[PDB]
Amino acid sequence: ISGGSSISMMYKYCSRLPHDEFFQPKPEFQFKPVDEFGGTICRITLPANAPISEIESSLLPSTEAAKKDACLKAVHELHNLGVLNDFLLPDSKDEIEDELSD
């Protein structure tokens, strides 16, 4: 699987993180630490300005990764729909490196 540019789009979603200086106020991030019996639970919730994007479910034993899941799944949930693309930065903001993003 040779990806890159596709990430720039997926990473952008993660870029919504707080630690991110380029992250705008609107998105939300929440991590739920659980036993290895269910890795970690990633809880993401977007503003009313956004329809879907929420992703709650474990998959990774790590928060950073667990979040990546919901974050990744969130992108898809937004990609599959993408009805508020007007609320989110278009490809214009996607004009960045795959690594740069997120």
PDB file of C-alpha atoms in Angstrom:
ATOM      1  CA  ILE A   1       0.000   0.000   0.000  1.00  0.00           C
ATOM      2  CA  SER A   2       1.742   3.099  -1.298  1.00  0.00           C
ATOM      3  CA  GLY A   3       0.055   6.108   0.259  1.00  0.00           C
ATOM      4  CA  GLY A   4       1.020   9.693   1.000  1.00  0.00           C
ATOM      5  CA  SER A   5      -1.191  12.373  -0.501  1.00  0.00           C
ATOM      6  CA  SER A   6      -4.148  10.441   0.858  1.00  0.00           C
ATOM      7  CA  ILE A   7      -2.706  10.864   4.331  1.00  0.00           C
ATOM      8  CA  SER A   8      -2.418  14.618   3.940  1.00  0.00           C
ATOM      9  CA  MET A   9      -6.198  14.445   3.951  1.00  0.00           C
ATOM     10  CA  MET A  10      -6.496  11.986   6.812  1.00  0.00           C
ATOM     11  CA  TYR A  11      -3.819  13.726   8.844  1.00  0.00           C
ATOM     12  CA  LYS A  12      -5.603  17.040   8.439  1.00  0.00           C
ATOM     13  CA  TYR A  13      -8.352  15.525  10.553  1.00  0.00           C
ATOM     14  CA  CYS A  14      -5.873  14.609  13.263  1.00  0.00           C
ATOM     15  CA  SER A  15      -4.323  18.040  12.875  1.00  0.00           C
ATOM     16  CA  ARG A  16      -7.460  19.138  14.687  1.00  0.00           C
ATOM     17  CA  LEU A  17      -5.642  17.945  17.785  1.00  0.00           C
ATOM     18  CA  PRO A  18      -4.882  20.432  20.569  1.00  0.00           C
ATOM     19  CA  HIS A  19      -1.137  19.882  20.610  1.00  0.00           C
ATOM     20  CA  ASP A  20      -1.435  21.084  17.034  1.00  0.00           C
ATOM     21  CA  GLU A  21      -0.715  24.787  16.705  1.00  0.00           C
ATOM     22  CA  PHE A  22      -2.554  24.811  13.397  1.00  0.00           C
ATOM     23  CA  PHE A  23      -5.610  23.273  15.015  1.00  0.00           C
ATOM     24  CA  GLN A  24      -8.722  25.426  14.934  1.00  0.00           C
ATOM     25  CA  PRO A  25     -11.351  25.585  17.688  1.00  0.00           C
ATOM     26  CA  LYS A  26     -14.334  23.402  16.873  1.00  0.00           C
ATOM     27  CA  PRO A  27     -13.246  19.753  17.013  1.00  0.00           C
ATOM     28  CA  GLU A  28     -12.874  17.742  20.199  1.00  0.00           C
ATOM     29  CA  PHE A  29     -10.610  14.945  21.372  1.00  0.00           C
ATOM     30  CA  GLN A  30     -11.058  12.500  24.226  1.00  0.00           C
ATOM     31  CA  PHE A  31      -9.120   9.393  25.184  1.00  0.00           C
ATOM     32  CA  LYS A  32     -10.312   6.588  27.427  1.00  0.00           C
ATOM     33  CA  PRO A  33      -7.592   4.407  28.962  1.00  0.00           C
ATOM     34  CA  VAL A  34      -8.628   0.778  29.257  1.00  0.00           C
ATOM     35  CA  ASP A  35      -6.985  -2.560  29.951  1.00  0.00           C
ATOM     36  CA  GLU A  36      -5.223  -4.450  27.185  1.00  0.00           C
ATOM     37  CA  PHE A  37      -8.462  -6.401  27.002  1.00  0.00           C
ATOM     38  CA  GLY A  38      -9.714  -3.529  24.878  1.00  0.00           C
ATOM     39  CA  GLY A  39      -6.744  -1.280  24.208  1.00  0.00           C
ATOM     40  CA  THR A  40      -7.974   2.290  24.464  1.00  0.00           C
ATOM     41  CA  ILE A  41     -11.263   3.965  23.631  1.00  0.00           C
ATOM     42  CA  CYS A  42     -11.009   6.989  21.370  1.00  0.00           C
ATOM     43  CA  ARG A  43     -13.798   9.525  21.725  1.00  0.00           C
ATOM     44  CA  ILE A  44     -14.034  12.221  19.079  1.00  0.00           C
ATOM     45  CA  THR A  45     -16.860  14.714  18.723  1.00  0.00           C
ATOM     46  CA  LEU A  46     -17.266  17.518  16.215  1.00  0.00           C
ATOM     47  CA  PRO A  47     -19.217  20.765  16.642  1.00  0.00           C
ATOM     48  CA  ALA A  48     -22.811  21.209  15.539  1.00  0.00           C
ATOM     49  CA  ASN A  49     -21.153  22.853  12.560  1.00  0.00           C
ATOM     50  CA  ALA A  50     -20.286  19.317  11.524  1.00  0.00           C
ATOM     51  CA  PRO A  51     -22.707  16.444  10.883  1.00  0.00           C
ATOM     52  CA  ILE A  52     -20.779  13.226  11.379  1.00  0.00           C
ATOM     53  CA  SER A  53     -17.213  12.625  12.501  1.00  0.00           C
ATOM     54  CA  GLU A  54     -17.719  11.111  15.933  1.00  0.00           C
ATOM     55  CA  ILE A  55     -15.901   7.836  16.477  1.00  0.00           C
ATOM     56  CA  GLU A  56     -16.066   5.871  19.708  1.00  0.00           C
ATOM     57  CA  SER A  57     -14.484   2.434  19.833  1.00  0.00           C
ATOM     58  CA  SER A  58     -11.250   0.771  20.884  1.00  0.00           C
ATOM     59  CA  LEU A  59      -8.802  -0.831  18.484  1.00  0.00           C
ATOM     60  CA  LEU A  60      -5.349   0.276  19.571  1.00  0.00           C
ATOM     61  CA  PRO A  61      -3.739  -0.318  22.972  1.00  0.00           C
ATOM     62  CA  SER A  62      -2.370   3.195  22.645  1.00  0.00           C
ATOM     63  CA  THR A  63      -4.162   6.513  22.967  1.00  0.00           C
ATOM     64  CA  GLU A  64      -2.160   8.175  20.218  1.00  0.00           C
ATOM     65  CA  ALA A  65      -2.962   5.276  17.921  1.00  0.00           C
ATOM     66  CA  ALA A  66      -6.431   4.653  19.306  1.00  0.00           C
ATOM     67  CA  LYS A  67      -7.158   8.267  18.444  1.00  0.00           C
ATOM     68  CA  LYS A  68      -5.654   7.732  15.011  1.00  0.00           C
ATOM     69  CA  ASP A  69      -8.304   5.081  14.483  1.00  0.00           C
ATOM     70  CA  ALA A  70     -11.291   7.224  15.383  1.00  0.00           C
ATOM     71  CA  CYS A  71      -9.490  10.058  13.633  1.00  0.00           C
ATOM     72  CA  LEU A  72      -9.002   7.938  10.536  1.00  0.00           C
ATOM     73  CA  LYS A  73     -12.505   6.528  10.793  1.00  0.00           C
ATOM     74  CA  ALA A  74     -13.713  10.069  11.374  1.00  0.00           C
ATOM     75  CA  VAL A  75     -12.161  11.182   8.107  1.00  0.00           C
ATOM     76  CA  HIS A  76     -13.940   8.378   6.290  1.00  0.00           C
ATOM     77  CA  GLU A  77     -17.192   9.204   8.041  1.00  0.00           C
ATOM     78  CA  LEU A  78     -16.686  12.748   6.813  1.00  0.00           C
ATOM     79  CA  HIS A  79     -15.374  11.609   3.450  1.00  0.00           C
ATOM     80  CA  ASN A  80     -18.273   9.260   2.816  1.00  0.00           C
ATOM     81  CA  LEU A  81     -20.555  12.176   3.603  1.00  0.00           C
ATOM     82  CA  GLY A  82     -18.649  15.424   3.219  1.00  0.00           C
ATOM     83  CA  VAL A  83     -21.688  17.675   3.363  1.00  0.00           C
ATOM     84  CA  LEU A  84     -19.980  20.301   5.489  1.00  0.00           C
ATOM     85  CA  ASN A  85     -16.911  20.544   3.288  1.00  0.00           C
ATOM     86  CA  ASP A  86     -17.713  24.242   3.393  1.00  0.00           C
ATOM     87  CA  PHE A  87     -17.013  24.215   7.112  1.00  0.00           C
ATOM     88  CA  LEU A  88     -13.728  22.384   6.688  1.00  0.00           C
ATOM     89  CA  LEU A  89     -10.690  23.529   4.743  1.00  0.00           C
ATOM     90  CA  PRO A  90     -10.741  22.252   1.153  1.00  0.00           C
ATOM     91  CA  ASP A  91      -7.819  20.899  -0.839  1.00  0.00           C
ATOM     92  CA  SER A  92      -6.503  24.438  -0.585  1.00  0.00           C
ATOM     93  CA  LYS A  93      -5.380  23.710   2.956  1.00  0.00           C
ATOM     94  CA  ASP A  94      -4.473  20.208   1.843  1.00  0.00           C
ATOM     95  CA  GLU A  95      -1.667  21.824  -0.119  1.00  0.00           C
ATOM     96  CA  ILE A  96       0.823  20.422   2.362  1.00  0.00           C
ATOM     97  CA  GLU A  97       3.057  17.414   2.897  1.00  0.00           C
ATOM     98  CA  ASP A  98       1.583  14.132   4.073  1.00  0.00           C
ATOM     99  CA  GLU A  99       3.906  14.299   7.057  1.00  0.00           C
ATOM    100  CA  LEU A 100       3.315  18.007   7.528  1.00  0.00           C
ATOM    101  CA  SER A 101      -0.395  17.407   7.982  1.00  0.00           C
ATOM    102  CA  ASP A 102      -1.723  16.066  11.261  1.00  0.00           C
TER     103      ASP A 102
END
